[PDB]
């Protein structure tokens, strides 16, 4: 029996420096976790102990911190090369800076194969991108060979910027001919490494014949066999055993997100490449594991430029950006308008004749805005100034909500109005009118929303049974500030871009900003 050790990471999201237990900025260094240097230590420890090791990434290394903002993918290429990853799969966030923002920094600098079988190219790009990403790759692991086939979320055109020259095919439909090609090459050990989510991983395991193990991402799924070592709640056992349509027991694995855990799976194979046994658990990268001094040296060397960028002028403001709690938690504030205008602009994705844009609405809780910005300091706006406004290192996510759920959210926004409570919503592409004399839960008297399936955008009343796409902070999607109706009634939720980054990009683009209080929220 030939034993294989699969080491895997997914949805790292620029968390190169060590983080807190909640994956935010490190405060107490003695109880800090994750980091690319700590991972290097654990990977090197395993490699010394096990003879057959494979380090795999299931996408979403891109987007997360100031590292991605400044180095734009070069940090991912450099540190993944240093950790000696065996193969990577393309995720949605790898297309965040367009197709050119993937080809140049990552695809051309990475010293390992980057995979995806369900991405097809057309137009002038087809010849330029051909061969830069492979559908599969046969990896020699000592005396044996292991085939790795890749896949990317079919939803990337709505979550990132791949452009009009890339087509995202159905995973099971595109994977099977590539799995069959590995079978003709007499490869009896096949891993499906991709970025489409846990539900899709289970489908590939059940329907794609020939696949022996599925290593996924996207959904930040945490699987654990036994007692969890931290705050993460297991979604199932590690591995998650799927019974395929051909009869085989197929293990499915995921290693949460933000580089907190290193996935660890031990597969036993027979001479014919059939799974005898599969066992393991994600290793918690905690304080007990020391940071490698060589990698930490590079981290600190690169961190200098990041500190220089945070004090640099991104753009100017000719208006006082009113982010005071007395304004933003009581009425329409121009800071709330600016962030929501930034949120919509960031989610402008290549649309067909069906809509001007797939998403037009934005909601942001007042308690999310933590500081104003003064325009009298030459008009200057720096990353540091924006960090005071949005300090919790959250993201701006895309959700699908029924009209009724959104009406319930606006009713929650003013249920205990006049107490400076945080649930008060700031908007974008929404027109609300409240009557505070009315009973709580029946205070929204007008709620108009900007259309999507229209060539000329205009405001129309919100329909209670119709599903609407909204950009809102991660905190709200997770039921924060009492928005339980958001968490319990959302139809779809997707991991977005970093909060500070979204607003920094918008200000840089605009050069000079002048947001006004234009009457998006009205009273009586």
């Amino acid at each position, epitope marked *: 029996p030939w034993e294989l050790t699969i080491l895997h990471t997914n949805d790292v999201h620029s968390r190169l420096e060590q983080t807190s237990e909640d994956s935010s900025k490190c405060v107490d260094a003695s109880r800090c976790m994750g980091g690319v240097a700590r991972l290097f230590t654990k990977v090197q420890q395993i490699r010394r102990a096990e003879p057959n090791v494979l380090l795999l990434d299931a996408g979403d290394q891109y987007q997360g911190t100031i590292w991605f903002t400044v180095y734009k993918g070069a940090e991912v290429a450099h540190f993944m090369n240093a950790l000696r990853y065996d193969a990577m799969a393309l995720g949605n966030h790898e297309f965040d800076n367009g197709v050119e923002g993937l080809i140049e920094p990552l695809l051309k600098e990475a010293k390992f194969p980057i995979l995806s079988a369900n991405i097809s*190219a057309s137009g002038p790009l*087809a*010849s*330029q991108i*051909s*061969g*830069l990403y*492979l559908p*599969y*790759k*046969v990896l*020699p692991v*000592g*005396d*044996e*060979v292991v085939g790795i086939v890749g896949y990317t979320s079919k939803e990337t055109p709505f979550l990132s910027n791949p452009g009009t020259n890339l087509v995202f095919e159905d995973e099971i439909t595109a994977l099977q001919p590539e799995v069959d090609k590995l079978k003709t*090459l*007499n490869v009896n050990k096949i891993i499906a490494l991709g970025h489409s989510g846990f539900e899709m991983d289970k489908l590939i395991a059940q329907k794609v014949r020939g696949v022996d193990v599925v290593v996924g991402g996207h959904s930040n799924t945490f699987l654990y066999t036994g007692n969890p070592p931290s705050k993460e709640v297991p979604a199932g056992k590690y591995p998650f055993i799927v019974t395929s349509d051909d009869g085989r027991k197929v293990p499915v694995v995921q290693a949460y997100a933000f580089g907190k855990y290193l996935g660890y799976l031990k597969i036993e194979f027979d001479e014919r490449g059939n799974v005898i046994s599969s066992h393991g658990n994600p290793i918690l990268l905690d304080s007990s594991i020391p940071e490698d001094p060589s990698i930490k040296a590079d981290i600190n060397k690169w961190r200098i430029k990041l500190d220089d960028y945070s004090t640099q002028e991104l753009g100017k403001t000719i208006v006082y950006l009113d982010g005071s709690s007395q304004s933003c938690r009581f009425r329409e504030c121009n800071m709330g308008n600016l962030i929501c205008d930034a949120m919509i602009n960031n989610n402008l994705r290549h649309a067909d004749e069906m809509f001007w844009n797939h998403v037009s609405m934005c909601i942001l809780n007042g308690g999310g805005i933590r500081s104003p910005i003064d325009e009298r300091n030459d008009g200057t706006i720096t990353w540091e100034n924006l960090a005071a406004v949005l300090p919790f290192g959250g993201t701006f996510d895309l959700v699908q909500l029924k009209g009724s759920t959104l009406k319930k959210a606006f009713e929650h926004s003013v249920h205990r109005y006049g107490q400076s409570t945080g649930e008060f919503l700031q908007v974008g592409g929404i027109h609300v009118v409240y009557d505070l004399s009315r009973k709580p839960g029946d205070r929204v008297v007008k709620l108009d929303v900007l259309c999507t399936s229209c060539r000329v955008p205009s405001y129309d009343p919100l329909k209670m049974d119709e599903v609407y796409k909204v950009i809102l902070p991660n905190f709200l999607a997770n039921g924060g500030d009492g928005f339980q109706m958001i968490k319990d009634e959302l139809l779809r939720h997707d991991s977005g871009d970093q909060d500070i980054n979204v607003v920094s990009t918008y200000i840089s683009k605009m050069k000079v900003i002048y947001p006004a209080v234009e009457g998006r929220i009205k009273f009586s």
Partner: antibody
Amino acid sequence: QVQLVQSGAEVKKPGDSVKVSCKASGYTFTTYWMHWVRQAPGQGLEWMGAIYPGLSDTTYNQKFKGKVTMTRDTSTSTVYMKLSSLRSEDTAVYYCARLLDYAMDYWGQGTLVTVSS
Amino acid sequence: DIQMTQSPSSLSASVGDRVTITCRASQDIRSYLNWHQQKPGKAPKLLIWYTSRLHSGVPSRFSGSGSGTDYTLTISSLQPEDFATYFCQQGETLPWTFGQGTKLEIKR
């Protein structure tokens, strides 16, 4: 390191049979494919067939079916290629190549087969 | 049987010049295009695999592009060791077929 050593140049008469060897070194012999390509003067490169030693699975080009037979010996890590009923048209430089997935990365020095009466 | 039409059949150039060799297939060979370099009386060495990916030890000056049926090999600044015969090959469907070749002669 990665090296493929082929048998010496051979001279055969029409109707004879020639057996060309290809010894492998520096890699796991059983997990790789062994291909055979011929180069005739002023005719270009022509693909003949392939063998997966770790299973003895063979695949030949329809033109060479019943004319070519590929064998292996996992002991000495040698691949043999046999050519029955030789003709003047079979006068070419025969190469053995290593393949993992996409391409034939390493080739052998070549074996010249001269067929004349 | 996929036919591989490689042009030019012969090319005369000097050290430092840009070299462009094109290869065209009768059918869409789905990016399975491999480039090989063969010196006289020697084994052909692999240059580029799957349209653009360089083989181990191949210098940065060599680059491959293309998609569907039309593919292209490029040598940015030609060197004295780069004067040899160049062959393209399709690995999409069997039997695998090679191009006629391109002889690279030193201009004097």
